[PDB]
Design an enzyme around this catalytic site. Structure first.
Site, short mmCIF file in Angstrom:
data_model
loop_
_atom_site.label_atom_id
_atom_site.label_comp_id
_atom_site.label_asym_id
_atom_site.label_seq_id
_atom_site.Cartn_x
_atom_site.Cartn_y
_atom_site.Cartn_z
N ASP A 41 0.84 -1.19 0.00
CA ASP A 41 0.00 0.00 0.00
C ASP A 41 0.88 1.25 0.00
O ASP A 41 2.09 1.19 0.24
CB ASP A 41 -0.94 -0.02 1.21
CG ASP A 41 -1.99 1.08 1.16
OD1 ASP A 41 -1.98 1.89 0.21
OD2 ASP A 41 -2.84 1.13 2.07
C1 LIG Z 1 2.44 9.03 18.40
C2 LIG Z 1 1.75 9.94 17.38
C3 LIG Z 1 0.86 9.10 16.47
C4 LIG Z 1 -0.06 10.01 15.65
C5 LIG Z 1 -1.27 9.20 15.20
C6 LIG Z 1 -1.94 9.89 14.01
C7 LIG Z 1 -3.04 8.96 13.49
C8 LIG Z 1 -3.83 9.70 12.42
C9 LIG Z 1 -5.02 8.85 11.98
C10 LIG Z 1 -5.85 9.63 10.96
C11 LIG Z 1 -6.35 8.69 9.88
C12 LIG Z 1 -6.68 9.47 8.61
O1 LIG Z 1 -6.25 10.56 8.46
S1 LIG Z 1 -7.74 8.75 7.33
C13 LIG Z 1 -7.74 9.91 5.94
C14 LIG Z 1 -9.06 9.81 5.19
N1 LIG Z 1 -9.37 8.42 4.93
C15 LIG Z 1 -9.56 7.95 3.57
O2 LIG Z 1 -9.82 6.82 3.38
C16 LIG Z 1 -9.40 8.92 2.40
C17 LIG Z 1 -8.78 8.19 1.23
N2 LIG Z 1 -8.33 6.90 1.74
C18 LIG Z 1 -7.41 6.04 1.02
O3 LIG Z 1 -7.00 6.36 -0.04
C19 LIG Z 1 -7.00 4.71 1.67
O4 LIG Z 1 -7.99 4.33 2.58
C20 LIG Z 1 -5.67 4.85 2.40
C21 LIG Z 1 -5.39 3.55 3.17
C22 LIG Z 1 -5.72 5.99 3.40
C23 LIG Z 1 -4.53 5.10 1.41
O5 LIG Z 1 -4.05 6.40 1.57
P1 LIG Z 1 -3.74 7.29 0.22
O6 LIG Z 1 -4.73 8.42 0.11
O7 LIG Z 1 -2.35 7.87 0.32
O8 LIG Z 1 -3.83 6.41 -1.01
#
Ligand SMILES: CCCCCCCCCCCC(=O)SCCNC(=O)CCNC(=O)[C@H](O)C(C)(C)COP(=O)(O)O
Ligand SMILES: NC(=O)C1=CN([C@@H]2O[C@H](COP(=O)(O)OP(=O)(O)OC[C@H]3O[C@@H](n4cnc5c(N)ncnc54)[C@H](OP(=O)(O)O)[C@@H]3O)[C@@H](O)[C@H]2O)C=CC1
Lengths: 84, 134, 216, 127, 395, 347, 250
Positions: A41
């Site tokens: 991925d």
């Molecule tokens: C110790 C500190 C740790 C910090 C923790 C931070 C955790 C942050 C968690 C927030 C999660 C998000 O943002 S989720 C962001 C929005 N989610 C989405 O699904 C939008 C498009 N998604 C996709 O394309 C695929 O699912 C994907 C697998 C994401 C591929 O990433 P790419 O788009 O590149 O291809």
């Protein structure tokens, strides 16, 4: 332009590529697209680049990350760069 | 109001009052009548950019005309202050504050609306009016 | 403008007659006529300032909020130099759930105005901090409690809730007690968060009468 | 100054993940987590945190999720949250999962939950 | 070909934790300082956020009055007063004159204790401890009046929709009048120790300077406005009770420094004494709560003798009154500034939305602008003049 | 993961809730030695899951203060006056209890209590009292790994004799035999550190040859829970050794490394010399009260138990039978406590 | 209009060209942050104009009507290099080739009247003929001569020891050893002698200031002359500009 031997850097990059869950089994060599051959991925690709960051002490540009696509391309990038 | 200073000062001096209440912070200028006239005329010049048949421009014209009149009959600068319920300094700052929002009003052009524009208005009727009498 | 102290004695008046009339009965019509594009509907109702008077409520769309606020602050006749607060109300029955409410004061007019922007969870409201510096914390609180995003905010961060809180508590779909609870563990010498358990559950008492009519 | 010779964001989450990975050593040093956990080990947890939100496809919801994830990173980076918070919420569960030994249950998923509790939807603590 | 000039960098991102000689409550303050001078202040709040606003939504209107007493533990009466005024506006309920007088009287009393605590705790933060102890005896005398009228020294819950919970006990007006006969002398004693003192002057003069434009921009109210030259008081500009009858003068200063606001608060105590004397002399006779028994509880003999009164008592102490659908924002001149409640009603017996407008929230927001260029020691004084209460800031 | 019941009779009726603090677990426990290092964690594990724990303690309100926080209202019952020689109090303590855990032990002798009393007489007397009741279903006794009848040290010999007596009276009792337990309040690493830092010389019996299998306190506490959640464990002795077997010299060296001590302060106090230096001091101990200056380390029994290999027998039950993977005691969270002292970037 | 971040400050008083009653053109003047530098023996004619980041090395002669504008990029004129009458030397912001866009002139270079040089590299001992245009990125290598009325197109090169002529400048003949060694240097030395002569009869402050001083004295005598503290006014103007920039909403 190869600052250090191509065989060494390739063996090291494929060693880190093996560490990822998949990207192994029957085909772990050159000419393998990360997302179209290895099942990786995009986030896994970025983490793999960061692991290569730790191995070879040199950073990768994000636009270059947009440009990098293959196992050949990553080793080419690391051999090209003088810090290596 | 009541001054909270033990020192004795004269508040009819019409300058010690301004120094005490801190009008100098609003503007370091003295704020005479002529400055007010100049500010109002500059506002009138500025609102020329707004289209002629725009309700906002008519409003600014009417307000500036009213204040230029109030300057007219009243030769005393304090009298203008009494009629307008303001220090002359803040009256002058008022027109500049109006000048500040002209660019923002010329970017969106609020006055442009269709010839069928209708804003519904809901009004509250108190029961005290009806119950006591009709 | 700024109510700098001018009259030393006999300022018993609440305000002048003309200033009261222009704001008692012409304020909404003046706003609608002067800036028609911003206004969608207006409500005159019980006054915020007092019981006896009547104060306006203006409904506007998110795109026009910044220009409407700028007009309200700096217009010569209408000088709402102060932002009392910014608030949101969640209406789950509506498609556009959230109603962002702005409360303003004109010291010169001695009047209060209420501005409402109706949005949903996905849409954002432009920040009005450049018009009033007080907005920053109020918009941060609105983001924390209700989840309304404010665009071009200098730094939109949560204020009231605990660090790591992801839910928005004042949403009507959020449980009153929440989802987690905090306890110290002896084994791991740390204060930890765990799923909620209640020794005694909250007792909701349904007092509604069939015969009541005031309920809308 | 001219000659004819002279002139001749679908991946927002990827950028946020890159930001988290690049900022990881700083939070390791700020939160004194060097000895407890490795950089790669934390880099592994961050992906699972990202993967939980995969199903969404709307751009606006994606924007909100990214902003919230950036907030989560900023809490650790700016020392709003503390070392024990990082231990409790990330490092400890990941280490616990590695140390877990479990017997592969011959009973199906239904039988195990049936033996456990009447209402499967209610959570279990200290499993 | 003209050389450029470089600059300097700021570090020392200190964390100023909960600290006892400061405004009461828990304050976490992150300060960025260039050397010994502060460049940014970022107050961290939420340490006393008890979810009051959401809890109100699950309670009836009369059940939610004690929330407002505990929002601000220094000034309880003013805090519950705005809530009862908003419910009265939506309900269209008229308060009898005796109850209006009792509300104004006790509002002035709580104003006086608030100012006493503010001034003497500010002096304690500076480091003078004698005015502080000299003040607790007065504050005890006023807490004794509270325990007489309500049975609780702090959280009275005395103000109710349509009037007051109970009538003034016999002998109270005489006692309040005696406390008033001696209050001015006590205040003068406190004023000599603070006012005229060189160390106090040096600590407070030209510290925390605010201008009128800055105050309106940041939404400040009360002593902050009046110490800068703004003749704005809600009790006069927007009267809410028999305050309109009352005769008193706004105290005004112009510099905006810490000293000017301290002088304003002392004069405010004196003006409140004048208002109390007028309340005592003009206290009317008659009903203390509204005659309507569909919004106010019936008297106990009346519930015990009449069927309609027992029905009204049962339905007011189980269901509560139904407030007509509507929205209102009612503000009162609290001792710390302007406290307002934005109440949204959909026609039920419980509030749908009860937003609380904190006077101290905007002051804490103003902290950063005010405490720029100051020192670590000046922060304590600046916090003292804001007089922030964090249960009041964090609802 | 699926929560497993506490395998106690009629638990299915009484149990209710998710298994947390406010839930109801059908376990009422009398943990003797609750205020101790081992006992406190066992009380925490049992009470965390909504069970009720009766904690008999010798009058000391400040020592039993942490146990108050352990459970919800009415779950942790603290009985004020515990005496090992008082039968009636023991009967009252286990009246409502269906499981009894004995963690009562003394590292050293005193004038009031000897090893034979605490480690032999109390287990036998308590075993008889538990046996006569019948309501008690599970019995767990905590002992050392090196405890043997043919042991030079009096402590480890008396412990094994008491365990045999317990096995005689209650055949279904489980004998938990953990190794040197590492924890924040442990007596292993804390005593070693105090020896390295506030003692003139650190005497090491022989050259540190003796092998040990240290285990973390949370692992033993979890092992107790796994014993109680399985009835098939009854009647069996479990040697809860740690994941790694280490010689004492390695542990001393690694403590010196983690604390970043300047050099090695340990000396070679070989055996046959400690047996002459501490032999009179044992008679000194048996006639004097508890004194902080000398204890545990400064005894002939400690030298005798540090000349043998306290390791699990090859054929034996352990953590694997309980499906627990023990955590390493030389790395990770286990070693954080010594790490806070000094790591060379510290002070 | 008014540059408020200018190195020496904003302009308190600006006068219109209509209101000028005499020519006030300065032969060396500063354009914002760029300051021309000159040696002691550098001759700039009164007609000549030198502005911007122009560095004049020793024995540099700027004759009547020549304009050397160093506004966009740097101009360097080497030792004993003469810019003759009405010859314009200018620098571009960028060059088409992609190299540095500065106009670097080497030593003993003679730029003949009305020749235009823009962002070119001129090597040592070179002659640019009358009305010869050398465009941006064109490089003349040392000991080369461009004939009068010739254009070097952008990005073009003239090799060393060669004479080039024509509008699309082309090779004509190889310069002889005597030419390259002597005559090219000798021309620059001759024009240095002429400029040395012009410098020797120049007064430090020539008596043209007296006429303006007469007007100033008349204003003083009639009491219209005003004493303005330009330093304080510059400070106040900058303060007002900063305050207004903070106040503005858009
Ligand atoms: C110790 C500190 C740790 C910090 C923790 C931070 C955790 C942050 C968690 C927030 C999660 C998000 O943002 S989720 C962001 C929005 N989610 C989405 O699904 C939008 C498009 N998604 C996709 O394309 C695929 O699912 C994907 C697998 C994401 C591929 O990433 P790419 O788009 O590149 O291809
Ligand atoms: N290193 C370890 O911690 C290991 C411990 N064990 C065994 O576990 C048991 C306890 O471990 P630990 O908790 O470390 O030992 P502790 O001494 O820390 O706990 C001892 C408990 O027994 C009580 N106790 C001791 N003597 C008496 C007495 N005469 N009458 C009443 N109560 C008494 C103590 O109460 P008070 O505080 O009032 O004495 C204390 O609560 C011991 O038998 C030990 O051998 C097993 C493996 C390793």
């Amino acid at each position: 332009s190869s600052f250090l031997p191509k065989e060494e850097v390739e063996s090291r990059i494929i060693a880190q590529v093996k560490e990822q869950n998949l990207a192994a089994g029957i085909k772990v060599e050159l000419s393998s697209r990360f997302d179209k051959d290895l099942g990786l991925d995009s986030l896994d690709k970025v983490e793999l680049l960061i692991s290569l960051e730790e191995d070879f002490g040199v950073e990768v540009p994000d636009a270059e990350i947009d440009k990098i696509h293959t196992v050949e391309d990553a080793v080419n990038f690391f051999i090209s760069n003088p810090s290596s | 109001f009541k001054a909270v200073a033990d020192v004795e000062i004269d508040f009819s001096n019409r300058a010690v009052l301004k120094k005490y209440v801190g009008v100098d912070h609003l503007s370091k200028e003295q704020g005479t009548k002529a400055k007010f006239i100049v500010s109002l005329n500059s506002l009138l010049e500025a609102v020329k950019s707004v289209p002629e048949t725009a309700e906002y421009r008519k409003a600014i014209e009417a307000t500036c005309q009213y204040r230029l009149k109030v300057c007219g009959e009243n030769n005393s600068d304090a009298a203008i202050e009494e009629v307008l319920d303001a220090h002359l300094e803040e009256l002058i700052a008022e027109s500049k504050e109006e000048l500040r929002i002209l660019p923002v009003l010329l970017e969106s052009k609020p006055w442009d609306v269709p010839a069928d524009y209708s804003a519904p208005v809901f009004d509250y009727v108190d029961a005290s009016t009806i119950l006591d009498k009709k | 403008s700024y109510c700098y102290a001018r009259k030393m004695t006999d300022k018993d008046y609440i305000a002048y007659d003309n200033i009261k009339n222009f704001g008692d009965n012409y304020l909404t019509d003046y706003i609608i006529k002067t800036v028609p594009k911003y206004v969608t509907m207006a409500v005159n109702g019980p006054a915020q300032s007092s019981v006896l008077y009547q104060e306006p409520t203006i409904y506007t769309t998110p795109e026009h909020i910044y220009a409407l606020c700028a007009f309200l602050r700096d217009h010569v006749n209408l000088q709402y130099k102060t932002l009392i607060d910014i608030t949101a109300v969640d209406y789950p029955e509506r498609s556009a759930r959230f109603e962002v409410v702005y409360h303003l004061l004109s010291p010169r007019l001695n009047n209060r105005i209420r501005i409402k922007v109706v949005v949903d969870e996905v849409t954002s409201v432009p920040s009005v901090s450049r018009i009033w510096n007080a907005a920053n914390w109020f918009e941060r609180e609105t983001w924390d409690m209700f989840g309304v995003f404010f665009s071009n905010h200098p730094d939109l961060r949560r204020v009231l809730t605990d660090y790591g809180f992801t839910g928005h508590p004042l949403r009507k779909d959020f449980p009153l007690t929440g989802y987690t609870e905090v306890r110290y563990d002896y084994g791991k010498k740390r204060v930890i968060s765990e799923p909620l358990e209640l020794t005694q559950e909250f007792r909701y008492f349904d007092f509604s009468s069939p015969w009541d009519t005031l309920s809308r | 100054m001219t000659s004819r010779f002279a002139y001749v964001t679908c991946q927002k989450a990827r950028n946020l993940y890159l930001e988290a990975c690049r900022c990881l050593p700083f939070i390791h040093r700020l939160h004194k987590l060097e000895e407890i956990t490795s950089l790669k080990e934390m880099r592994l947890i961050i992906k699972d945190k990202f993967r939980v939100n995969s199903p969404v496809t709307d751009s606006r919801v994606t924007d909100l999720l990214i902003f919230k994830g950036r907030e989560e990173l900023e809490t650790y980076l700016f020392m709003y949250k503390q070392r024990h918070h990082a231990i409790t919420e990330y490092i400890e569960p990941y280490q616990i999962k590695k140390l877990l030994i479990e017997r592969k249950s011959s009973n199906s998923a239904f039988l195990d939950s049936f033996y456990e509790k009447a209402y499967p939807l209610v959570h279990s603590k200290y499993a | 070909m003209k050389p450029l000039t470089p600059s300097k960098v700021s570090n020392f991102t200190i964390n100023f934790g909960p600290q006892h000689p400061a405004a009461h409550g828990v304050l976490r303050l992150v300060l960025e300082m260039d050397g010994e001078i502060i460049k940014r202040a970022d107050p961290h709040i939420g340490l006393l956020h008890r979810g009051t606003e959401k809890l109100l939504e699950y309670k009836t209107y009369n059940q939610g009055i004690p929330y407002f007493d505990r929002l601000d533990y220094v000034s309880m009466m003013c805090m519950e007063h705005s809530y009862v005024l908003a419910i009265e506006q939506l309900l269209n309920v008229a308060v009898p004159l005796r109850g209006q007088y009792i509300r104004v009287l006790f509002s002035e009393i709580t104003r006086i204790m608030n100012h006493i605590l503010a001034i003497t705790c500010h002096s304690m933060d500076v480091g003078a401890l004698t005015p502080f102890l000299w003040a607790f005896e007065e504050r005890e005398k006023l807490f004794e009046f509270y325990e007489r009228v309500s049975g609780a020294r702090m959280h009275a819950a005395y103000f109710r929709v349509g009037g007051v919970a109970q009538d003034l006990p016999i002998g109270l007006l005489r006692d309040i009048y005696d406390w008033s006969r001696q209050f001015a002398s006590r205040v003068d004693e406190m004023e000599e120790l603070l006012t005229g003192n060189r160390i106090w002057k040096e600590r407070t003069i030209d510290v925390g300077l605010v201008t009128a434009q800055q105050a309106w921009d940041w939404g400040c109210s009360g002593p902050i406005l009046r110490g800068s030259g703004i003749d704005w008081d809600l009790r006069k500009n927007q009267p809410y009770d028999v305050y309109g009858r009352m005769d008193f003068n706004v105290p005004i200063a112009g510099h905006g420094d810490c000293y000017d606001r301290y002088l304003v608060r002392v004069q405010e105590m004196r003006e409140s004494l004048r208002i109390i004397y007028q309340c005592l002399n003009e206290m009317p006779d008659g009903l203390y709560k509204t005659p309507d028994q569909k919004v106010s509880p019936p008297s106990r003999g009346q519930m015990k003798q009449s069927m309609e009164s027992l029905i009204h008592h049962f339905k007011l102490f189980s269901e509560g009154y139904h407030v007509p659908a509507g929205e209102t924002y009612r503000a009162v001149e609290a001792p710390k500034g302007e406290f307002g409640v934005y109440l949204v009603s959909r026609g039920g017996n419980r509030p749908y939305r009860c937003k609380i407008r904190s006077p101290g929230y905007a002051h804490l927001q103003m902290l950063d602008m005010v405490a720029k260029g100051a020192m670590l020691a000046d922060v304590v004084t600046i916090i003292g003049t804001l007089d922030v209460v964090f249960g009041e800031i964090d609802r | 993961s699926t929560l497993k019941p506490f395998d106690l009779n009629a638990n299915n009726a009484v149990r209710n809730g998710p298994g947390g603090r406010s839930s109801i677990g059908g376990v009422v426990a009398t943990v003797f030695g609750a205020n101790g290092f081992i006992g406190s964690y066992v009380v925490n594990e049992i009470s965390k899951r909504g069970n009720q724990v009766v904690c008999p303690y010798r009058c000391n309100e400040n020592k039993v203060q942490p146990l108050k926080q352990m459970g919800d209202l009415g779950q942790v019952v603290l009985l004020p006056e515990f005496d090992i020689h008082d039968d009636e109090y023991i009967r009252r303590a286990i009246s409502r209890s269906n499981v009894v855990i004995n963690c009562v032990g003394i590292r050293q002798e005193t004038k009031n209590y000897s090893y034979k009393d605490v480690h032999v007489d109390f287990p036998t007397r308590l075993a008889k009292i538990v046996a006569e009741s019948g309501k008690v279903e599970r019995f767990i006794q905590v002992s050392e790994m090196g405890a043997d009848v043919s042991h030079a040290s009096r402590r480890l010999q008396t412990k094994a004799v008491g365990d045999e007596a317990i096995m005689k009276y209650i055949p279904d009792a489980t004998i938990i035999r953990p190794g040197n337990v590492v924890g924040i309040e442990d007596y292993f690493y804390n005593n070693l550190i105090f020896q390295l830092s506030y003692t003139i010389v650190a005497p090491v019996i022989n050259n540190g040859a003796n092998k040990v299998q240290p285990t973390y306190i949370l692992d033993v506490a979890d092992a107790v829970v796994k014993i109680l959640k399985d009835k098939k464990t009854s009647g069996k002795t479990y040697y809860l050794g740690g994941p790694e077997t280490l010689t004492m010299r390695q542990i001393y060296d690694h403590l010196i490394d983690t604390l970043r001590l300047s050099n090695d302060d340990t000396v070679n106090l070989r055996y046959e010399l400690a047996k002459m230096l501490y032999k009179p001091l044992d008679t000194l101990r048996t006639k004097l009260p508890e004194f902080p200056f000398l204890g545990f380390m400064m005894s002939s029994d400690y030298a005798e138990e540090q000349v043998a290999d306290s390791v699990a027998p090859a054929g034996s039950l352990g953590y694997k039978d309980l499906s627990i993977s023990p955590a390493k005691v030389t790395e990770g969270l286990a070693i954080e406590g010594v790490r806070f002292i000094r790591v060379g970037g510290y002070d | 209009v008014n540059f408020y971040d200018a190195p020496n400050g904003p302009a308190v008083e600006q006068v219109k060209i209509e209101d000028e009653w005499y020519n006030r053109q300065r032969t060396e003047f500063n354009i914002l942050n760029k300051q021309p530098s000159k040696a002691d023996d550098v001759f700039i004619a009164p007609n000549a104009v030198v502005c911007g980041d122009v560095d004049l090395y020793q024995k540099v002669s700027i004759f009547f009507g020549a304009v050397v504008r160093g506004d966009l990029n740097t101009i360097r004129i080497g030792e004993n290099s003469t810019i003759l009458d009405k010859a314009v030397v200018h620098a571009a912001s960028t060059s088409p080739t992609g190299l540095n866009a500065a106009t670097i002139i080497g030593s003993n270079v003679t730029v003949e009247p009305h020749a235009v040089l823009r962002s070119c590299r001129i090597g040592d001992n070179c002659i640019v003929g009358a009305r010869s245009v050398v465009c941006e990125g064109a490089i003349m290598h040392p000991e080369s001569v461009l004939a009068p009325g010739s254009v070097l197109a952008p990005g073009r090169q003239i090799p060393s020891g060669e004479l080039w002529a024509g509008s699309p400048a082309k090779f004509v003949r190889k310069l002889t050893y005597y030419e390259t060694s002597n005559v090219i240097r000798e021309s620059a030395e001759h024009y240095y002698d002429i400029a040395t002569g012009f410098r020797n009869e120049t007064f430090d402050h020539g008596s043209a200031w007296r006429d303006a001083e007469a007007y100033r004295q008349k204003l003083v005598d009639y009491k219209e002359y005003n004493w303005v503290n330009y330093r304080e006014q510059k400070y106040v103007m900058r303060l007002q500009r900063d305050a207004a920039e903070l106040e503005k909403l858009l």
